[PDB]
Design a protein around this ligand. Structure first.
Ligand code: HEC
Ligand code: HEM
Ligand code: K
Ligand code: MG
Lengths: 268, 102
C-alpha cells in the first residue's frame, strides 16, 4: 500500500457523513462513477473514461447523464476540503464508499487518475445504454466496454439500489423495497415477482403485481429473456456472497478502464 | 442510540416494508409497533416465513443488533430482503427508535 497526497481516512468518513444526511445520494454517486467510465470504447480507444470529463460540455448535456449534476455538486464541497485528490479519483472513491455504506462489498481503492483539462477529450453521444432497449443493445454496449456476460449481469445488479426519476430518464420508481441497501435483491426481485404492464407511466415499464410499488425497465427484464444472462440472474439470486465478490471485481475493472500505473491505497 | 437519527434511518431504510404507528397496517413486512422485547413471528394479521414463524428468538436490543447487521446469516430462510446496517452507531440509533414505539 501507498499513502496518497490527500487524507483518505478523514475523506472516507466525510463521504459516509454526507450520505447519512441524504441516503438517496448513495445510489446517485454509484451512477455518476459508472457513467464517467461508460463513455469508453475498447475498439476505437476513446471516450476518456475515469477522467471526470463529464464536468464539461458536451458530455455533461448528454441525455443519459441527466441528473448527474447533483452528485457532482455534492462532491465539489469535498474537493475544496481535500484539494490534493483529483475529481476522477474522488468520484470513484465516493462510489466505493456508498457501495460499502449500503451493505455491499469493500472494493480495494487504487489512486492516481488524472483529470481531463476540458471538453475536447470527450467522446460522442450514443455511448450510454438506453432503458427502452433489450439484450442485443445491452450486449453491444458491454462488449464495446470489454465486459463478458457474467460481468454485465453482475454490474446491472447495482439497480438493487436507487430509483428512476421522470425528469431524468422518463421512468419512475425503485427496483426493490430496500432502495438505500446494496445486496443481490435485484435478482431475487426479477425472478420472484410477476412483472405486469404499469398503465400509469407513459414510457413502457413493468411493475410487480404483488404491490405495484416496484419497477423493471425493458433492459432489466431482457436479462431473463436471454439464455446466457438468465443463468447469471439465477446464480446471483441464489448466492449474495458470490454477487458481492463478482460485483466488486467488475466495478473495480469498470472504474480502472483507460487508467495507467495507479497506486494501492491503504485499507479502512 | 439517538432517537432522532433512528427515526430518519427507519424512514430511509424500513418505510417501504414496515409501518411504525400503533395499529399500523401490515404490508411487505409486519407492523413493528411494540416489537422491542417481543417473541418473533407474532404480529397480528401477518403471514411470516417458515423460519421466522418457528424461530425461538426474542427481539431484545442485543438480539436486534446482531439481526440488523445480517438478517439472512442470523435467521436463514427469512423473507426480509434487507442488506443490513454494517455500522454499530446506525444499528444502535435504529434500535433506540424502535424502543420508543411503546
Ligand atoms: C422489505 C425489503 C424490508 C425492509 C426494508 C425491512 N424489513 Fe424487516 N421484515 C421484512 C419482512 C418481510 C419480515 C418478515 C420476515 C419473515 O421471514 O417472515 C420482517 C421482519 C422484521 C422483524 C421481525 C418481526 C417479528 O418477528 O414479528 C424485525 C424486528 C424487522 N423486520 C426489523 C427491521 C428493521 C429495523 C428494518 C430497517 C432498519 C427492516 N426490518 C427493514 C421486510 C423488510
Ligand atoms: C443496461 C445498462 C443499464 C441501463 C439501461 C441503465 C438504466 C438506468 C436508468 C434509466 C436509470 C434511471 C435514472 C434516473 O431516472 O434517475 C438508472 C439508474 C441507476 N443505475 Fe443504471 N442502467 C444500466 C446499467 C447500470 C450499471 C452497470 C450500474 C452500475 C454499476 C447502474 C447503476 C444505476 C444506479 C445506482 C441508478 C440509480 C441512481 C439514483 O438513484 O439516483 N446502472 N439506470
Ligand atoms: K436493495
Ligand atoms: Mg468520461
Amino acid at each position: 500500500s501507498e499513502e496518497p497526497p490527500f487524507d483518505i481516512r478523514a475523506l472516507r468518513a466525510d463521504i459516509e457523513d454526507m450520505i447519512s444526511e441524504k441516503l438517496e445520494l448513495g445510489p446517485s454517486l454509484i451512477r455518476l462513477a459508472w457513467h464517467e467510465a461508460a463513455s469508453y470504447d475498447c475498439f476505437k480507444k476513446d471516450g476518456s473514461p475515469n477522467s471526470a470529463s463529464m464536468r464539461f460540455k458536451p458530455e455533461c448535456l448528454y441525455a443519459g447523464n441527466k441528473g448527474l449534476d447533483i452528485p457532482r455538486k455534492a462532491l465539489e464541497t469535498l474537493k475544496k476540503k481535500y484539494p490534493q485528490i483529483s475529481y476522477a479519483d474522488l468520484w470513484v472513491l465516493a462510489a466505493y464508499v456508498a457501495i460499502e455504506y449500503m451493505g455491499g462489498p469493500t472494493i480495494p481503492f487504487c489512486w492516481g487518475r488524472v483529470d481531463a483539462k476540458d471538453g475536447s477529450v470527450c467522446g460522442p453521444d450514443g455511448r450510454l445504454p438506453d432503458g427502452s432497449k433489450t439484450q442485443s443493445h445491452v450486449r453491444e454496449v458491454f462488449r464495446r466496454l470489454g465486459f463478458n456476460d457474467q460481468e454485465t449481469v453482475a454490474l446491472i445488479g447495482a439497480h438493487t439500489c436507487g430509483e428512476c426519476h421522470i425528469e431524468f430518464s422518463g421512468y419512475h420508481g425503485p427496483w426493490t423495497h430496500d432502495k438505500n441497501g446494496f445486496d443481490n435483491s435485484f435478482f431475487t426481485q426479477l425472478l420472484d415477482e410477476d412483472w405486469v404492464l404499469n398503465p400509469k407511466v407513459e414510457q413502457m415499464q413493468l411493475m410487480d403485481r404483488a404491490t405495484t410499488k416496484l419497477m423493471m425497465l425493458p433492459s432489466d427484464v431482457c436479462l431473463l429473456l436471454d439464455p446466457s444472462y438468465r443463468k447469471y440472474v439465477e446464480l446471483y439470486a441464489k448466492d449474495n456472497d458470490r454477487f458481492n465478490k463478482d460485483f466488486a471485481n467488475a466495478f473495480k475493472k469498470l472504474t480502472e478502464l483507460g487508467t495507467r500505473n495507479l497506486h494501492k491505497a491503504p485499507a479502512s | 442510540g439517538d432517537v432522532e437519527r433512528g427515526e430518519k434511518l427507519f424512514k430511509g431504510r424500513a418505510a417501504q416494508c414496515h409501518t411504525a404507528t400503533k395499529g399500523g397496517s401490515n404490508g411487505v413486512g409486519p407492523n413493528l409497533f411494540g416489537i422491542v422485547n417481543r417473541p418473533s413471528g407474532k404480529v397480528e394479521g401477518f403471514t411470516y416465513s417458515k423460519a421466522n414463524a418457528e424461530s425461538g428468538v426474542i427481539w431484545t436490543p442485543e438480539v436486534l443488533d446482531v439481526y440488523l447487521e445480517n438478517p439472512k446469516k442470523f435467521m436463514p430462510g427469512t423473507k426480509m430482503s434487507f442488506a443490513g446496517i454494517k455500522k454499530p452507531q446506525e444499528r444502535a440509533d435504529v434500535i433506540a427508535y424502535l424502543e420508543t414505539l411503546k
